[PDB]
Design a protein around this ligand. Structure first.
Ligand code: NAP
Ligand code: NAP
Ligand code: 9L9
Ligand code: 9L9
Lengths: 286, 284
C-alpha cells in the first residue's frame, strides 16, 4: 500500500524554516518585516476559509498580512484602485486577489489580475509570470503556489522526475496549466488532460506521476492508476465530509505515494505562498 | 499513402487574401500602409536567408518591411536603443528580432525580446503574449508564426482537433512550447516530449496529431507513427530534410507536410497575417 505524503507535517517544517528567516531578517534590517495583502471581492464561504488559513500561516511566521474584503456590489474600477494602491505602496511586498471574484457586476478577472505588479505577484497569476514559467524561464518568476507545493510533495518521495511520464488532469489557470509547465521544465514527459479528453481512464494509466486538479469528487478511479504511481490530489470537495478528486481508498492500494485529502496539497499551497512572500521581501531589500 | 499538406499552395492563398485586404485598406484610408521592421544581430547565413524570404513576402502583399542588421559586436545597450526606437515609431505596426542573436558579447536574449511592446510583438515572443497563449487567453495575443502555420495545416485536413491525442516533440520558445498551448486550447489531449523523454518511439506512437520541432534530421522514424496520424514536420535540416523520416512516415500517415514547401511557407505567411492584423488594430 502507498506511503502517505503528509502535507500537514511537511508544511510545518517549511513554516518553521520561514519563521526563522523572518526573525533573522529582522535582526539584519530592524523594524523590517515581510508584508502581504490579500484582496477579496464578495463573501464566498470557501474563499473566507482559505483566506483565513493563509492569515494564520502568515501570523505564525511573522509576515504582516492584511485582508481587504470588498463587497459583491464592487465594480472593476473600485478593485483597480486597490491594485494600483498596493502596487505603489513600497511597504507591501506581495499581494494577491483571491479567486474567483464574487461580484454581481461583470468584472474582467484577467484585466484585474494583470494590473498586479509582477514583482509583487506572489500568486504567480499575471500573464508575465505565467509566460516566463510556460517558456522555461524559472529563475525570475513567481510560480503559482499549488503547483509549487505539488512539486515539493513530489520531491519528498525521493523519486527523480526527469524521464518520468507525468499526467496532469485539469488545465486551470491557477493549478493545472502551471502544473504542466513545472513538470515539463523539471524534465518530465507531460500529458495534459481536460474535460474534452477521450478515454480519460486510459490516459491516466500512463502516469508515473499523476496530478489531479478537476474539482470533480473522487472521479479518478483507483483502477485507472498505474501501479506504483506517485499520486498528487489537488481536489477539495464537500460531499455527503471532504474528499479529493481521486478515489482515495482504491488508489492507495496501487500508488507508491499518495496525498491524503485533507492534509496533503492544501497546507503546501499555503506554505508556498508564505515562501514566495518572504522571497519578495528579501528581493525588495536588494 | 498520406495526402500531402501543400504548404506552398496554402500559403499562396493566404498571401493573396492578405494582399487584397491591404489593397482594400489603402482604398478605405488613403496613404496608409502596414509597416514591419526586422532587427537582426550578427550575420548568420540561415538568418539572412529566412529574413530575405520574409521581405519578399511583405513586398508581394504591400507591407512595407525594413530590415536593420547590427554587427556581431553590438552591445545589449545598443540593441535596446533600436528596440526603444521601434517601440516609439508610430508608423511601425509590428516588429521582430530574428533569433538566435549572433553576438560576440553576451547579450541577454530574454531581456532584449521582452523590451518589445506587446502590441507590436508580431512574433509572439514576449513573456506577456506567451503567458496569454499559455493560459488560453487567445484573443488578446500574437501567437508565434510557426505554431500558427502548423495549426492552419492541421485544419486543412478537415479533421477536428478536439479530443485527439496530439504529440509535440520539442519545447522551444518559438515552436514547440507555443505549439503545445495552441493544440491544448483547441481541445487536444497533448503530450510534450523533449531530449530527456525516454521511449520517444512510444510517445510518438500515441499521436493522432504529431508535430515534430527538434532540429534533428530524420530522427523521428516513420515506423513510430500511428497509422492515420496527421504529421507536421517543422524541421529544416541541411539536400534539405525534415525532422521526420518522410518516406516511411508517408506510408502510415493520413496527412503529412513535405520538406521543403510544408511548414516553412506557412510560417512566413502567418507573420504577414499578424502584421496586417497589427496594422488593422492600429487604425482602430
Ligand atoms: N480554486 C480554488 O479556490 C480551489 C481551492 C481548493 C481546492 N481546489 C482544487 O484545485 C483543483 C483546481 O481547481 P480550479 O478551480 O483551479 O479548477 P477549474 O477552474 O474548476 O477547472 C477544472 C479543470 O478540470 C477539468 N475537468 C473537469 N471535469 C473533468 C473531467 N470529467 N475530466 C477531465 N477533466 C475535467 C477542466 O477541464 P476544462 O478546462 O475542459 O473545463 C479544467 O481544466 C481542483 O481539484 C479543486 O477541487 C480549488
Ligand atoms: N530556429 C530557426 O530559425 C528555424 C528555422 C527553420 C526551421 N526551424 C525548425 O524549427 C524547429 C525548432 O527549431 P528551434 O530553433 O526552436 O529548436 P531548439 O531551440 O534547438 O529546440 C529543439 C527542441 O528539440 C528537442 N530535442 C532535441 N533533441 C531531441 C531528441 N533526441 N528527442 C526529443 N526531443 C529532442 C529539445 O529538447 P530540450 O528542450 O531538452 O533541449 C528542444 O525542445 C525545428 O524543427 C527546426 O528545424 C528552425
Ligand atoms: N489568488 C488565489 N485564488 C485562489 N482561489 C487560490 N487557491 C487557494 O487558496 N486554495 C487553497 C486550498 C486549500 C487550502 C487549505 O489550507 N486546505 C487544508 C484545509 C484548511 C483548514 O480547514 O484548516 C487542507 O486541504 O488540508 C488553502 C488554500 C489561490 O492559491 N490563489
Ligand atoms: N524571431 C524569429 N526568429 C526565428 N529564428 C524565426 N524562425 C523563422 O524565421 N523560421 C523560418 C523557417 C522557414 C522559412 C522558409 O521560408 N522555408 C522554406 C525554405 C526556405 C528557402 O529555401 O528559401 C521552406 O521550408 O519551404 C522561413 C523562416 C522566427 O519565425 N522568428
Amino acid at each position: 500500500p502507498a506511503e502517505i505524503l503528509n502535507g500537514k507535517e511537511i508544511s510545518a517544517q517549511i513554516r518553521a524554516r520561514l519563521k526563522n528567516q523572518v526573525t533573522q531578517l529582522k535582526e539584519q534590517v530592524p523594524g523590517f518585516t515581510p508584508r502581504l495583502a490579500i484582496l477579496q471581492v464578495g463573501n464566498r464561504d470557501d474563499s473566507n476559509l482559505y483566506i483565513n488559513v493563509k492569515l494564520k500561516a502568515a501570523e505564525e511566521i511573522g509576515i504582516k498580512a492584511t485582508h481587504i474584503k470588498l463587497p459583491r456590489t464592487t465594480t472593476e474600477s473600485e478593485v483597480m484602485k486597490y491594485i494600483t494602491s498596493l502596487n505603489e505602496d513600497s511597504t507591501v511586498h506581495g499581494f494577491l486577489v483571491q479567486l474567483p471574484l464574487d461580484s454581481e457586476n461583470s468584472i474582467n478577472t484577467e484585466e484585474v489580475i494583470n494590473a498586479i505588479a509582477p514583482e509583487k505577484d506572489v500568486d504567480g497569476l499575471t500573464s508575465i509570470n505565467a509566460g516566463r514559467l510556460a517558456r522555461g524561464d524559472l529563475n525570475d518568476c513567481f510560480i503559482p503556489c499549488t503547483p509549487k507545493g505539488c512539486l515539493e510533495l513530489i520531491k519528498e518521495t525521493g523519486v527523480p522526475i526527469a524521464g518520468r511520464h507525468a499526467v496532469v488532469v485539469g488545465r486551470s489557470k491557477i493549478v493545472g496549466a502551471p502544473m504542466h509547465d513545472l513538470l515539463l521544465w523539471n524534465n518530465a514527459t507531460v500529458t495534459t488532460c481536460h474535460s474534452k479528453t477521450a478515454h480519460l481512464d486510459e490516459e491516466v494509466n500512463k502516469g508515473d506521476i499523476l496530478v489531479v486538479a478537476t474539482g470533480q469528487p473522487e472521479m479518478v478511479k483507483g483502477e485507472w492508476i498505474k501501479p506504483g504511481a506517485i499520486v498528487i490530489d489537488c481536489g477539495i470537495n464537500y460531499v455527503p465530509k471532504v474528499v479529493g478528486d481521486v478515489a482515495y481508498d482504491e488508489a492507495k492500494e496501487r500508488a507508491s505515494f499518495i496525498t491524503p485529502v485533507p492534509g496533503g496539497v492544501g497546507p503546501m499551497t499555503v506554505a508556498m505562498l508564505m515562501q514566495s512572500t518572504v522571497e519578495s521581501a528579501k528581493r525588495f531589500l536588494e
